[PDB]
Structure 1
Amino acid sequence: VVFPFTAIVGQEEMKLALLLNVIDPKIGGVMIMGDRGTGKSTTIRALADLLPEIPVVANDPFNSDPSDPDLMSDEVRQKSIEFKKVQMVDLPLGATEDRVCGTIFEPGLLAKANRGILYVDEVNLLDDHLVDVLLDSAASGWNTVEREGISIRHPARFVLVGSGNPEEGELRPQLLDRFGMHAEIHTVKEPALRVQIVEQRSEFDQNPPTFLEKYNPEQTALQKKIVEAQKLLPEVKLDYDLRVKISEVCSELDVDGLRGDIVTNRAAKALTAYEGRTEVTVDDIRRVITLCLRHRLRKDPLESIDSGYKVEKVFARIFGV
């Protein structure tokens, strides 16, 4: 039993963030920000049942693929089947590295997290000491147990989601970077959508196994659209002039550089590419640049003005509207 994905109401930006990162497991981690409730856990939980079946080998927690290039493991000695879905690998609050990585073999939490989706809890409460060690091993590619005199490395490539709390401050500016881009969640105030959410929740609760039937065609239409858009990635091209055009708008924001501009063009051919259109445009980048790369900024709290206005204003003049 699980809640349907498309049955949710609103939350276009957050769902848009999932739509971008899900196709490419190389853009990086993605923060999601917002107040309590709002079904943040449900949405990512709703993400589980939208994908083609992924293959296992026999039972391994990594189970990336029975035949793939990066399969550095002792099982290759045997080399030299079944189809499953994604399993969410949420970790408890105040955990310890004894099972996240392991000791002197035993498996790890990140081992089960391989190729899946790792929903980490409130990172503001979590201490930096227990998370800095392999915060995202995808950049490293595989595991590293060089500590305590061990030499085992296994793949740990997967996507991250932050899900912080905007009540006890934010993470350190150094730690905020290298993750990815931001994501804001609003709060509905119109009673119509409120009562709609209440009615949908009550109807699902009353009839668990029959509600999803009324929302069946969308749950497969979206999956088919994503599957079709998956194969269009290695065909999109970007104009040389447009590539340098953005380079004259990031500098005025005093961006750290060399990674802020490497994620826009890494994800530019996903919003303009999943619609089926091959040639990139200018206005399409407009949507993907307002939120992405904005969270870097320069951490200037001594200012009271529309922060988003800063992103679009400098962007308009360089691109000439």
Structure 2
Amino acid sequence: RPVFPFSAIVGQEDMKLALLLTAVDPGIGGVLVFGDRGTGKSTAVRALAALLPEIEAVEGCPVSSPNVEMIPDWATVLSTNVIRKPTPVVDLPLGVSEDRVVGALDIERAISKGEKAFEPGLLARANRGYLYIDECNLLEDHIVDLLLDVAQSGENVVERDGLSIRHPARFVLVGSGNPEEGDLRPQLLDRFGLSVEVLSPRDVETRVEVIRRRDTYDADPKAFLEEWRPKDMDIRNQILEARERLPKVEAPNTALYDCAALCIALGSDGLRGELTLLRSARALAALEGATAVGRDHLKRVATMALSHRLRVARTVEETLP
């Protein structure tokens, strides 16, 4: 499908790299995509994510469970048609009402349906996909918090109204926002997974490229869909190996050392960051088409996983070449 890999580009690598890594492991965290919205972030997301194997799931099912046996009682979807559908991407609007985000339970509907009274909130209809947050900065703190953990753990908690409504929510939180607004809640910023480094200059050509792929996709004459599909699968293949190596470490007396050294030297210490960096870096090799371990992997992910917090410096390369 119309995806824009690393075939030819010198700039927006961070964007792709981050969104791909999170697609592998959700434990990384929400991708804090810096930069303005004019860059057409959502546009890129609604193309890049197409590489992922079109998920198998019930037709109009919000959570889109594969088999009917995994459909939550409230989601009594009559059309139990298990079909193939592309990666769902929902653009989280700025200033969205928290209740509308997760869902609610109407009183009238409740007394006449019970659990069936649950409203299909945004996240409820964004499972197994991507959630593009416009701006994490100019937004309610509690909204960011909720979204961050939901994406982390994996449950769209709707314990409100009068029932403990809940259901899985495994999705990639694309937390977009401006470069910086004013040290807004560093605690939440740390919780984020990777972030597109703003300090590094980028090309402009990617703009036209993305726009063209946006056009040549919707109602594509069976051209761009096929062409890229093989590559889509190739990447997916490596993604499997990444997860296989996720709970393992090929070279202990290497990855652990270099990783910790970088974090400490840059002063960007923090269990949350460190342990995540060590994982993302290893999984990174999948996108590179390599084994797993590699110093430069740690270095690259460092200038992403650390970037979204204080105590960071360009010393990355200078610390450990």
TM-score range normalised by the length of the shorter chain: 0.7 to 0.9
Percent identity (aligned) = 48
Q: CA deviation at 1:102?
A: 2.6
Q: 1:158-210 CA distances to partner (integer Å, 9 max, x unpaired)? A: 11111101364353211211111220354547xxx49xx65995898699867
Q: Does 1:139 find its partner at 2:144? A: no
Give the aligned partner of residue 102 of structure 2. 101
The structure with more strand, counted as a fraction of residues: 2
RMSD: 3.7
Q: Distance in 2 between matches of 1:255 and 1:126?
A: 26
TM-score, normalised with respect to structure 2: 0.77
Task: Kindly indicate whether the alpha-carbon contact (under 8 Å) linking 1:72 and 1:155 is maintained by their aligned counterparts in 2.
Answer: no
Matches within 5 A, 1:125-164: 125-164=138-177
Task: Kindly indicate whether the alpha-carbon contact (under 8 Å) linking 1:29 and 1:159 is maintained by their aligned counterparts in 2.
Answer: yes
Q: Distance in 1 between matches of 2:213 and 2:233?
A: 27
Q: CA deviation at 1:34?
A: 1.4
The secondary structure found in structure 2 opposite 1:271 is helix
Q: CA deviation at 1:74?
A: 2.9
Task: Kindly indicate whether the alpha-carbon contact (under 8 Å) linking 1:122 and 1:162 is maintained by their aligned counterparts in 2.
Answer: yes
Structure 1: which 5+ residue stretches go unaligned? 299-306
Q: Distance in 1 between matches of 2:282 and 2:122?
A: 33
The secondary structure found in structure 2 opposite 1:162 is strand
Bigger relative contact order (CA 8 A; separation at least 6) = 2
Task: Kindly indicate whether the alpha-carbon contact (under 8 Å) linking 2:89 and 2:130 is maintained by their aligned counterparts in 1.
Answer: yes
Give the aligned partner of residue 72 of structure 2. 73
Q: Does 1:229 find its partner at 2:234? A: no
Q: Partner amino acid for 2:84?
A: F
Matches within 5 A, 1:136-215: 136-166=149-179, 168-169=181-182, 171-184=184-197, 186-188=201-203, 193=205, 213=223
Q: Between Structure 1 and Structure 2, how many residues are aligned?
A: 298
Q: Does 1:294 find its partner at 2:307? A: yes
Q: Distance in 1 between matches of 2:164 and 2:289?
A: 45
Give the aligned partner of residue 240 of structure 1. 252
The secondary structure found in structure 1 opposite 2:159 is coil
Task: Kindly indicate whether the alpha-carbon contact (under 8 Å) linking 1:63 and 1:114 is maintained by their aligned counterparts in 2.
Answer: yes
Q: Partner amino acid for 1:33?
A: F
Q: Distance in 2 between matches of 1:203 and 1:138?
A: 28
Give the aligned partner of residue 275 of structure 2. 262
Q: CA deviation at 1:256?
A: 5.1
Q: CA deviation at 1:32?
A: 1.2
Give the aligned partner of residue 110 of structure 2. none
Q: Partner amino acid for 2:223?
A: E
Q: 1:212-255 CA distances to partner (integer Å, 9 max, x unpaired)? A: 837953x1232121122133231564322121443244234444
The structure with more helix, counted as a fraction of residues: 2
Q: CA deviation at 1:269?
A: 2.0
Q: Partner amino acid for 2:250?
A: L
Q: CA deviation at 1:130?
A: 4.0
Q: CA deviation at 1:112?
A: 0.4
TM-score, normalised with respect to structure 1: 0.77
Structure 2: which 5+ residue stretches go unaligned? 106-116
Give the aligned partner of residue 281 of structure 1. 294
Q: Partner amino acid for 1:18?
A: L
Q: Partner amino acid for 1:213?
A: A
Shift of the 134–72 alpha-carbon distance from structure 1 to 2, 3 Å rule, reads farther
Larger radius of gyration: 1
